[PDB]
């Protein structure tokens, strides 16, 4: 009973997390019905179905080449398609060779060829260039070759077997691709933009709410969760890569172009990760119980404040532009003011106001100043990268 | 020609990277031959092969359930096994129901059941609890149910079809598992230990060679590559998870136990990542062209040096123990001396020797002192975690 309730509760949590995870089941269902309706009503004239396995093969390929995205269906489909053709060709030919050899060695020779081919192909699987986008093609190549070359049938029906396998595969793939590109689609590149924009906004929110915590200007658990929310940015390496890879087979679905540079998206993601690198260091200083007396804080309050405010506005403005997919240069004035703020702080440091203080408490105050200066420089670099990701791609 | 040479050159690079990537192809080959030799010589009496697809199914399942590890074959095998049984059972039964209904609705009713079942199963696929280790079971469940319930055969041969499918699957899985656990095996947990030990050693090497660079005690590209080698530690999140998941199906292969706590391995990996977090910050200070005059460096040389030396020895000693799989407490004396070093530095800071210096160059020197103190504290925490990962598991 309690286990049943826990299972049910996860249902609403997953369903309400994303409304598109409950409409994809109906799509899988409509697939497995449309394909299984063509055969029964056998249109476009009659067929052969010599081995009586057309229905099984058509149904099977529709379940394994239908994935959540629309950039993981074309790719899987194209692999399952080509591989079979090539493997079949090489197969039907091989059977001719063994016939000439005779009637006793013929089975032994066939085994040797399939052994060598399987070993060579599965060694290629370990390469770092065919593993990112071609891990399925090699697997189907081994599968199709071994099935056709060692089916156990007679030599006067191998051509029909090869034709039947190819026909079922292409029929299933065509139906699966059409559905997922007509009735309520889900694109994969469009899930890389929003992810990048959310990362920008999350960092901005933390930066815009730093002066209150650091200067003690002020429930506690709720505010802690709001502050400590940068973990996502630091824990999204394995996901920004995949979605980028999955988004190279997409067609030009409207505004997005054929050659959209997703490589720059990963580069900008790394730069945002570097900003979050130092942010985690800064946050640990605040969380720590040890503290320095608040009185000193006012002495250098003015310079530190300016940095936090201008930094946050720059990030937020960029996420706004990157989202609406329109280029802008509003962040230039904000980063310029931040550079002016650092120069003013340096001029203030000439006066040496920070003298006559305890060196032990000085170490903590000094480290904070260090982190802020890097974030001002790091933001400047990120500004250049974004100012070009919106130029190589058409952001009109 | 040039493309051919590039392809060939990658061959030696991949082959010499790991000698075990060239012996796994022969294993795949021996598999696809042994299975295909049983049928031809039909031992243990004769069989039926009513539909003439036993050879195809046996060959097919051997190519898709053979993976590089030995913790990704049992798992895949067990899934492909159970799923079919359960799905078949539910299938043969469903056919009985439709018969009672009549002879016209019978096909329409069957389609409705398979539609509902497919939609429900593929929604479960999106859960975060059945995706880490059970993403294959659901897929085979949909596959087997849809094939049996919609094969298109007569009602007097469905039982034989279900029996044939189950028999081929179990035969292929048994052969594939036996090979990969008898002739030259490759374990997956054993590839998590060495990875953790290598991470420990890499961090130690950087820490043990910090005083020379920071104090200018001293080709350049070679030394830069030796220093800047911490990227691996920071870029191994997506791999320490997988290998851990793949290593829950392993049997007690000798010293390793049935319930080895790989969760603690991931926790120690996160702690090492936190040490590498701050290490990258420290390295960027060195790389930067801007510098502070070397003269001041000697003033506080003694405290900083001690920290680097003792820190490195502690890491190295641990990797030695963790590798030979024997517990030790040699790192206790090293971290204790580091704590003594920090107290001595604090006592030196009482005297305020660092006065009468330029505040602008002071910021850089001060930040370095900050980073070192955290690494001394962070190392202490890691010592506690390691001192228990070797206790929950049997490290005798």
Please characterize this protein's 3D structure.
Chains A, B: Belongs to the aromatic acid exporter (TC 2.A.85) family. Chains A, B: Malate transporter critical for aluminum tolerance. The STOP1 transcription factor is required for ALMT1 expression. Chains A, B: This is Aluminum-activated malate transporter 1. Chains A, B: Keywords: Cell membrane, Ion channel, Ion transport, Membrane, Phosphoprotein, Transmembrane, Transmembrane helix, Transport. The structure is a homodimer of 396-residue chains. Chain A has 396 residues and is mostly helical. Chain A folds into two domains: 2-179, no CATH class; 190-392, Methane Monooxygenase Hydroxylase, Chain G, domain 1, CATH 1.20.58. Helix content of chain A is 72%, strand content 0%. Chain A has helices spanning 2-17, 24-40, 54-64, 74-101, 105-124, 135-149, 158-179, 190-208, 211-214, 220-227, 231-234, 237-246, 262-287, 294-299, 301-324, 331-350, 359-392. The first copy, chain A, is elongated, with a radius of gyration of 31 Å. The two termini of chain A are 57 Å apart. The interface between A and B is large, with 68 and 68 residues.
